[model samples]
Target: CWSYYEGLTPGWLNDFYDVNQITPNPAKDVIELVTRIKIFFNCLQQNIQRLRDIEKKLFPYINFEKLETDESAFWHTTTRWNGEVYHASMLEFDPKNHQFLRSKPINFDTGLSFWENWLHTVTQSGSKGIVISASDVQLNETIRLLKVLRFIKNDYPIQIVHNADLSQDSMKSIIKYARSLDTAEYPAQELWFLNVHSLLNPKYSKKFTTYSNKWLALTFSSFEIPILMDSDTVPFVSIKKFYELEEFQKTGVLFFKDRVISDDLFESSELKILREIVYGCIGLDLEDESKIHEQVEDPVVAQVLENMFIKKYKHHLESGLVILHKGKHLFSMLTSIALQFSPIAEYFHGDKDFFWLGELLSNNRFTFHPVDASNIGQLGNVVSKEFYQICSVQLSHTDRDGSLLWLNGGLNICKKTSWEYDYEHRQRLNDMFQNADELREYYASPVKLEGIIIPDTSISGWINSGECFLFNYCTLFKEGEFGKLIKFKEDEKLRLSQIVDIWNKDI
Candidate 1:
């Protein structure tokens, strides 16, 4: 046994092996154990090396700095009223940096050469789609894209513009299946990625964070008139009428008003008042910024434009779905910059900030269109020569076919009652008094529809008038009662052209 193990083991170890042991050879068990220990140590050494390699490759790119002290004010600075902590950080990049940190062009085309050609062909002839999705693979926005495609696949040739980080193969598969659902040939591309980093200067390339890509989406739309739809929205109506609007044709931009009722923040002189609050908070001197004057033209208008950004609005124009065209390049560029780099951008991340920012940047030249009343009619009365008040509550028709109609709950359903008061009303009153001293400081505190004054507590909780997608099935009664559906007149609805014409004339 010693001769067999010669040269493989140390000379001393070979001498120690008792080859002439009686029944059991303890050397065999010892050799086996030693061999196992050697194998284990070899694996352990390789694993340690692999971990070090991974750490060396990954750690440098993770630029986050740990908060050193718990008591620091900066740590608590970003704490929201709801308990979320938003960490703030400045972005920086080097051109000579590694590929991980460097900005990359979109896998498709950075300049959108092919997209422009496609848009020209589609728009010149008929309807087309421009859907934007800034969401990543981790987000469920992809599901929204699929739904939208399925809904509007028959209407237009849709083009999905999304983040490059998502799997292109996955998007293609979804699109293929979506088309198969209807057995329709929706002339749409696979996917076009918007890599924000590639659009920026190399020195500031790293500054193009994930959220900043939307700015590029606004700027990079090469279509003559590009319609942008947020991933959450689906086009239920024929959106082709959107491009034909007189206001859209005149202003070259369109912002759809939200359905939730509130003070129209962009209404007339309110815009000037709104901006004064925003500029004060951000400390941006509009006078000093030369580009502002160049874009706005009027000096006073420019000043008001800058001032309005000081305080953000509870209800601003929804940027989720918008149409962009000529004469909006400057506004789009400035709006994008402010949203990404300005101090106000750090505080607000929603459509409100983007809407107000665009208003200021464009000198309030854009059009704000409301949801079409025909789709969801409000409870309004017109002189009716044809229909009599036969029933206690009746369906009032503006047109013969009932497409243009209103549900009349009559006086029995429209009036407010005292018994409707509850815990919610009690809380509303309490909330008003919580800031009683400040509320009283204002002179002549009368109830106003859109004013910031305290709300009137006497009114009932039921929705009196508004456009609701579910309006067809439900109608509200004054004292918290339900009404029955009257008629179906979708085809006889008034033409959108006439409705838009009336809207333009009024505004």
Candidate 2:
């Protein structure tokens, strides 16, 4: 029932008005609106519920393991503040293509007063800590999180930090700054939540690899902890929910998989060495050639190679979306760091697999939410709306693959052509079907560019001709280092061809 754009957006007339004109024209005092507003200020509540309802129908076939505990709380990348309390930012959609620096920021100060008042309602009694990982830094600059944290004081126990240490802020300074809070520690559990991001100028050298690997290794250390791999976008679900997943599945990796990789021949050893170095960056041990190397003729070896191919495909999910790992397993952190550091790698784009996480999952402690983006994106357009609803509900309920709220369902039902962008081909896709299916589309259609001089098979007949024979002979004599040894005169084509054949007979 819900279409794409709703709530906070209202209609076009509202769009015509500026912030100054928005409330004043209705003649409501801003001061009065602030003091009297204690109700569930749902900016886009109707539309959100509608979306959830539509999506719920798509939840049957996929695995949607429900969390038993009511301890986990929902998180939002951005939240609203009315100078008192906080509200989910999901209600407000940013304008299309509106750059944060270019566009005017939304004013969230109005709802900042009662930050903790709302949090306690959502959190469970067993919740020892709360984490809120923002998707983009622009969200924070629009509404200051520190300011909202200041207002919460002693109502609930939570620790919050920037997702990706974006600023030059030190971790020590960050923890020190958070600990200075006047909030009560009566629950007496030390819990922290952090945001993650791609690293700045992260290298793939030994120094960088050691740093990345250590983080994932440390995560599984002795602690009943839940760490989100940056993109999990916490504050949507609770640490307690994570615990429920842990209780249900003995495996500790709440979401995602991990691995080790191998080196190869034919490619330069230097490049092969670099691949191993990159694998080490994600805390993966390199598989020696002896383990994977086998003659292609052996059936057992062939099956092993096939299995390796499948493992590579499965391992692609380890680096992104969300990772819920227990304690400092170092692998999880190392993976997140490796992904951030190696932005150019094909794994991020679903190209190559056999990642760092695969090895860990092969050992133990990993379970996944089935409705990952890789699945939905691969699912074609012929899928039923009922199925779409089934998947949505399953994805929402699942502990990992926490992208339910962010998925735009429009792509799910639309024709495949909806996502089909035009390449620089001169003719339409349909027009080409009338001819040979094997024929490639002309490059000129979509773009104006250069043509290359590829070797054509038709020219194969020309190579045996006398003119060409003399041409090749003369060219070889002119270009080769041993040209002086040839006795053929420059103008004598037939003699040169004969001389070329005669000279080569001795070899």
Candidate 3:
């Protein structure tokens, strides 16, 4: 479950491009490698500039600090001197601090190292046999990796994935696949990488292409391999009977249960917006169109609201349709393999228990759709008939694909408008609002007054009432979404070094 941030950062880059090992040692090829590395460094500089530009634009809240070494990434709050610069000092910690709770090197190195190793594994192995969908901008790296994979001999397939049909692909022969964006949601540039092998070669790009390949590969195997398909690139696949896998049922991968898959595809951005709306409407901040009128009426915020929620809630609404599996792989009896290979990349991508279970069942006997489009609802319906039966039944443990949903083998679709919640998962948020009267006043207000404001009916005891109001009403909480949460579900016997110790480990 290590995240992209933790595994794809620093030393991993250094180890990734240790070119001397593959090319001539200080090779006759210094010309080729040097030029590439120079270009790589230049890209890095540009990335920094763009990051700073974002900081300037966004201002105040978001800041940037580069780490020279992995160890230097420890956290420290800054104190501004007069008006010019800020001084930094280290903060102490307790005995066993988890990386998720603190900004520590463990998660950082873990993400980068995971990415590097995954890239090394896939790149070295070459082309893998699988489907792909991605955006035009994302396609450059996708194709570059595909070429590199082909060079290395993994031999996989890639669909010309894009959000909206960039244009009619006049070049028909090369157009094996094109995004059916008209029928899907968020049909924008969601890059989908396909069939990357697991091989490590020192002399690789370590830039956008390499980073993407590395990140996707490393993350995919964490859970059941992610469809990794996003909006922009989900072309059409005639898959039918798409249902959730049995063993991995009940996993909250989609976040909520209001989402539905349909025949029509949405604009990639629209899909994102829907996800945002759904998420906000239900979970963190349950603001709908009514609330939108009260705010500044920023269309972008509304769009963002839709994108974030729907993205998360779809996982909950219907796990069956988006999933590609039949029954479960009975691997509980096996010890070594299940633990080692059970959890693939989903945990990193944000899939929780359901995803890990997929990895547990992912041994050859059960193969799910590794590549999927972002408009999962549309993608689910577009899949071929041979895929699965769609219905409302829960996935069965033995059904390889998630055919359990439909008693008869069919695509177990997720378009049900009616959703029923069994019990309060925890506390009912609306109840808390009812308990505190000021909730409605805050929502209906349009003015950004000086300091803080509180309603007369609110219960005031512990914290600052105004701050709490801001916390409750503010969009920043929702906008931030989820921070990268990295998990290392490795066996105690296995050390991190073993995964990266390519030379000596048996792997």
Q: Give the least accurate 10-residue stretch of model 2, judged by summed lDDT.
A: 386-395
lDDT of 2 by residue, 19-72 (tens): 334342121221111111111222222243443332122111111111111111
TM-score of 3: 0.19
lDDT rank, highest first? 1, 2, 3
Candidate 2, residue 306: CA error in Å?
A: 6.7
lDDT of 1 by residue, 1-507 (tens): 123223243322211122344414232333332332223223434433432232222121111122212212211111111223222211112212201111121232223322232233212212234546454542334444444444444343333443345454655444554444454543332233333332233434344455454455554432345567655343434456556666567667665432222222334344343344334323334334555556565443454343333222233344555677623433343333443343333334444346545454333465454222111223323253311111111122222222322212111211122212321233433354444333232211211111001111123111222211112111232212222222323443333222222212211
Candidate whose TM-score is highest: 1
For residues 157-224, write the lDDT of model 3, one tens digit per residue. 22232223223332121222222222222121211222212111212212214113322232332122
In candidate 3, stretches whose alpha carbon ends up further than 4 angstroms from where it belongs are 1-113, 124-507
RMSD of each: 25.5, 29.5, 27.1
lDDT (Cα atoms) of all candidates against the true structure: 0.34, 0.26, 0.24
